[PDB]
């Protein structure tokens, strides 16, 4: 595809606005947004997490006005939704010390988002190649010990919700030319969430040549992970807590050959 | 709808200067700026916080000089937290850091937030625990379901009353608020250390990318804030939220609209 | 006051250079730059700190060359905390980090603050606990009510005397101070770690958005500071505030004004 | 003498690859991990096993055969598999009773370099009496001065799984034809902060607009990404490393 | 000194490149780069540190090609700490973090400092404790009084000797050093985690706001550094300072002066 001129006029722009809910495991009917309590295996060889203990990537495919012209994603506004809910320290939490308030959600986090004109492309990497991933997840197949550092057989598309576990997959930096992605892993038991919200911040999606993601088939792909940390209940057991993510994307019509 | 030119001349500008006090719960007549001590439910199902244990959003609606079409447009903001040094009182019924130590300072989870708009801040409800029973005298997300733990679009509100909207169940609705500029930071964790900056040399510009600030409908300016600074730990170890007031200085100019 | 042109030439400019020593409480003749050990009250109603336990704002009023209308305009500031490496003394009566370890260094809650103005820094009172009884020899919010814990507009003052205005009672009043530029950071918590930078290559510009700095009424420059670096913990576990001096260098120029 | 840049569609090329970490690989299942760390009784008796010592990674990448030289102009790079560190259910020591496993945390070193020849190294030893093991390349004739600076300890990063991270740093007195960047974050309580994006580029050009020039049409990439330590249920700790992605843009440059 | 034009031509520039080794106390023949283990006095009065427990400032006087009038002018600096990876040795008689764990790395209070000037760094004495009794072989503030704990202007000195001036009682004098550029950071706390960046792509410009860098008196360039990285804790729990060398590359040009 050669990239030619942007179309102008009143009908040459459009806006997509939506939210992506987190997929943390949802271990029962009251615990949407949470994972199952985490259990620890006795040995590397016996690691076999249940499905409801594994946070997964979220993805949405948004149809665009039907249009060679293609919609070009130019700017993004994005925000984690419900940051203040993490101030509930009065609900079945373990106390920080005798007579203290409950521990807030804290510890290891992953905040990630992407915007593309096609599915986010994934590369599989495993903490422990002998981990037995559960049915209903899509995970790196034919794992070897090299899968612990880099096995290039582990290629996938983020093309399904509640399916691709966060811990097995990262964006593939060798692909994804038609996607812009951003993530931060902050690891450690003592990690303290720092969540900013504002309606004044914009990310520009144009590459160095001034071209944004081009939406194949008139579809925009949004992807997210917002694992905010772990919630600790009274017994000390811990579970992941996630939050929804807002996306506002501006697009314009671009001609290509 | 259609924004035209800015008016010039000495009479074309005005300023609003004020402070918003915090509403942390005020459990008795000596404890303004504090919540009630925090307790913990045995289960999610039994979570029923007291009114005086829940910090709320602060709001002020400020009448501007009558114009009539012209509208006041908010252009700049200076803001700061008032009384940061009071958190150096570590000798007033605090729990000692260790044997013979000084009192622990206010610390832990904090939320700092302010907004400026030409109409009420628009809110979206999100709950940590949908079975939380919110108390009488608060305005909270109604008909809560388990989906309210992540996103339930039913939960819409306006920040149009003080001591009413609990912080923990409401956030600025990013799908609305076209005519408002908002800024917030949640810093979460038991070991969070307050970092509070003060200066009179910093200004935030409120213009959007087309150079247009909030436009004040009916000649009203809306200021909103939350400054939960952390928790104060008393000698027994029980903890209560501590908040501080926020100063606002807004410059506005007349703008013609159709 | 209408502000007009800047004067130029050899002696259109002058420089002020000095240090402000900290006023931490100075509980005996060997403890300059420290407070008294902190003790904790049993209740809010019984909080009555002794004077030597309360750090105070430092201030100097520096007379400038008589001009008369012209006024001296404060244009740039260089500033630096003096003696930062003194805090590496971990061998002097401190409490060991663990068995056989070095002494704990000064750490924990800090307030670093400085201001330059053409008149006294203007203060607003805010109290952690309105029932606190402040001691004789200090200037503190009077007629305190429960509203003083958040905002009571009665508590207005000028930083016009040393060893007098306790840091915990007073902040710069953001509703005033048009003729002062102030800057401050409170970093609170037991686990706060001091981060102190020094360099002679950094300059802060004092001009406002119109290109006008502080204008020195009666030819006086007002410098104010607090540098509570944290707390020193001695062998017994008791803790006391430790502060350091602050260097100021201000360039000023002559400015013509009307009225 | 460096002269003009060549233009035309044949004048640019691109190198893209991953460097795997070399953490020690103590058994056939533990690629990316070191052996459990044990501690010597004295400085004099410090003698770590090979599989306990992370090493620098390096790849020499051949370029299209070309006086013209390939000039390295820009770099995109990130750590690959950052999310794998969210596995807190695999034989980890629990944070507290009934809690999740501790994540990888503690001392980290993240390092990358791009050059037109092998990275040049200077040796510095924590403890000069450390006996380094067979199969590593380490500062020879160590003296007590080697603990601060002994200029005899010079080497080229010209072999994988060989140069231990703790012995060697880039020689700042050399490396005129390499650009290097590294951060050591030290302490038991260090928490990994790992950013990924395909939108960030590092420019490799010096202050005269000249990037690394590839001698013999070879590009040298080097890395260390020791992310911290994993603690298993017994409390013993091993280094965990991750791979690093490199994409380098290059252009043809004439030289005399 | 009125400063005139810069010379040009091939011969008008020169470069100084070297390493300054740290002076941490070197308590025995095997422990170069370390201090003696730290012990604590029972009173301020009895504070008597041994010489080998006291890190000192490092300095090098580098003679430059003889010029005469012309002076060498220091224009740019590359600098970095050498050996940052040695701090990953957590297997050498360190105290375990916990049962069966690795040894604690170097951590805690640090001071990183460097300066370039055309004459000795000028120093001001400040004392944590004015009654500290500094040892023979060190150069320390004389006639200390209680005012020395905050500012006593009698305590002036030149950094004109190696392993002599202890770090803890001297800082750069901000009322002087017109002809030097200095940069330092103290990061204090038992829980300080060292963050050490290395790169050969960073340059510090030494020119002042008038475009004039340090002018080298008698054709001598003065380099100074302190890099106390933290403390090493051995198995017994005793702790000692650990330092590293610093690289300096300075570009200088000939400048005419009257």
UniProtKB/Swiss-Prot annotation, chain A:
One of its GO terms (biological process) is virion attachment to host cell. The intrinsically disordered C-terminal arm interacts with neighboring pentamers. The unstructured nature of this region allows to make different interactions depending on the structural context: pentamers present at the 12 icosahedral fivefold axes bind five pentamers, whereas pentamers present at the 60 icosahedral six-fold axes interact with six pentamers. One of its GO terms (cellular component) is host cell nucleus. GO terms for molecular function: structural molecule activity. Changing residue 237 to T: In strain: Isolate YI. Keywords: Capsid protein, Clathrin-mediated endocytosis of virus by host, Disulfide bond, Host nucleus, Host-virus interaction, Late protein, Phosphoprotein, T=7 icosahedral capsid protein, Viral attachment to host cell, Viral penetration into host cytoplasm, Virion, Virus endocytosis by host, Virus entry into host cell. It comes from the Viruses. Belongs to the polyomaviruses coat protein VP1 family. Homomultimer; disulfide-linked. The virus capsid is composed of 72 icosahedral units, each one composed of five disulfide-linked copies of VP1. Interacts with minor capsid proteins VP2 and VP3. Interacts with host 5HT2AR. It comes from JC polyomavirus. Changing residue 237 to F: In strain: Isolate MAD8-BR. Changing residue 237 to Y: In strain: Isolate TKY-2A. It is found in: Virion; Host nucleus. Changing residue 50 to S: In strain: Isolate NY-1B, Isolate N1 and Isolate G3. This is Major capsid protein VP1.
Swiss-Prot record, chain C:
GO terms for molecular function: structural molecule activity. GO terms for biological process: clathrin-dependent endocytosis of virus by host cell; virion attachment to host cell. GO terms for cellular component: host cell nucleus; T=7 icosahedral viral capsid. Forms an icosahedral capsid with a T=7 symmetry and a 40 nm diameter. The capsid is composed of 72 pentamers linked to each other by disulfide bonds and associated with VP2 or VP3 proteins. Interacts with a N-linked glycoprotein containing terminal alpha(2-6)-linked sialic acids on the cell surface to provide virion attachment to target cell. The serotonergic receptor 5HT2AR also acts as a cellular receptor for JCV on human glial cells. Once attached, the virions enter predominantly by a ligand-inducible clathrin-dependent pathway and traffic to the ER. This is Major capsid protein VP1. Changing residue 51 to K: In strain: Isolate YI, Isolate TKY-2A, Isolate MAD8-BR, Isolate HER1-BR, Isolate NY-1B, Isolate N1, Isolate N4, Isolate G3, Isolate C1, Isolate CY, Isolate MY, Isolate AIC-1A and Isolate Tokyo-1. The intrinsically disordered C-terminal arm interacts with neighboring pentamers. The unstructured nature of this region allows to make different interactions depending on the structural context: pentamers present at the 12 icosahedral fivefold axes bind five pentamers, whereas pentamers present at the 60 icosahedral six-fold axes interact with six pentamers. Belongs to the polyomaviruses coat protein VP1 family. Homomultimer; disulfide-linked. The virus capsid is composed of 72 icosahedral units, each one composed of five disulfide-linked copies of VP1. Interacts with minor capsid proteins VP2 and VP3. Interacts with host 5HT2AR. It comes from the Viruses. It is found in: Virion; Host nucleus. Changing residue 238 to T: In strain: Isolate YI.
Curated annotation (Swiss-Prot), chain D:
Changing residue 49 to S: In strain: Isolate NY-1B, Isolate N1 and Isolate G3. Changing residue 84 to T: In strain: Isolate YI, Isolate TKY-2A, Isolate MAD8-BR, Isolate N4, Isolate C1, Isolate CY, Isolate MY, Isolate AIC-1A and Isolate Tokyo-1. It is found in: Virion; Host nucleus. Changing residue 236 to T: In strain: Isolate YI. GO terms for cellular component: host cell nucleus; T=7 icosahedral viral capsid. Belongs to the polyomaviruses coat protein VP1 family. The intrinsically disordered C-terminal arm interacts with neighboring pentamers. The unstructured nature of this region allows to make different interactions depending on the structural context: pentamers present at the 12 icosahedral fivefold axes bind five pentamers, whereas pentamers present at the 60 icosahedral six-fold axes interact with six pentamers. Forms an icosahedral capsid with a T=7 symmetry and a 40 nm diameter. The capsid is composed of 72 pentamers linked to each other by disulfide bonds and associated with VP2 or VP3 proteins. Interacts with a N-linked glycoprotein containing terminal alpha(2-6)-linked sialic acids on the cell surface to provide virion attachment to target cell. The serotonergic receptor 5HT2AR also acts as a cellular receptor for JCV on human glial cells. Once attached, the virions enter predominantly by a ligand-inducible clathrin-dependent pathway and traffic to the ER. This is Major capsid protein VP1. It comes from JC polyomavirus (JCPyV).
């Amino acid at each position: 595809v050669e990239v030619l001129e942007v179309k102008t006029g009143v009908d040459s722009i459009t806006e997509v606005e939506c939210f992506l809910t987190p997929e943390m495991g949802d271990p029962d009917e009251h615990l949407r947004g949470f994972s199952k309590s985490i259990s620890i295996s006795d040995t590397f060889e016996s690691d076999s997490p249940n499905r409801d203990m594994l946070p997964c990537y979220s993805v949405a495919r948004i149809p665009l006005p039907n249009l060679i012209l293609m919609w070009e994603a130019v700017t993004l506004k994005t925000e984690v939704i419900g940051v203040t809910s993490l101030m509930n320290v009065h609900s079945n939490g373990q106390a920080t010390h005798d007579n203290g308030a409950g521990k807030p959600v804290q510890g290891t986090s992953f905040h990630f988002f992407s915007v593309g004109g096609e599915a986010l492309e994934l590369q599989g990497v495993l903490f422990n190649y002998r981990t037995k991933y559960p049915d209903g997840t899509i995970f790196p197949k034919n794992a070897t010990v090299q899968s612990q550092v880099m096995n290039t057989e582990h290629k996938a598309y983020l093309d399904k919700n509640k399916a691709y576990p966060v811990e097995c997959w990262v964006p593939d930096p060798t692909r994804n030319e038609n996607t812009r992605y951003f993530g931060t892993l902050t690891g450690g038991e003592n990690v303290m969430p720092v969540l900013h919200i504002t309606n004044t911040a914009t990310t520009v999606l144009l590459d160095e040549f001034g071209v944004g993601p081009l939406c194949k088939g008139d579809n925009l792909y949004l992807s997210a992970v917002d694992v905010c940390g772990m919630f600790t209940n009274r017994s000390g057991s811990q579970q992941w807590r996630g939050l929804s993510r807002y996306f506002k994307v501006q697009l314009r019509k671009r001609r290509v050959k």
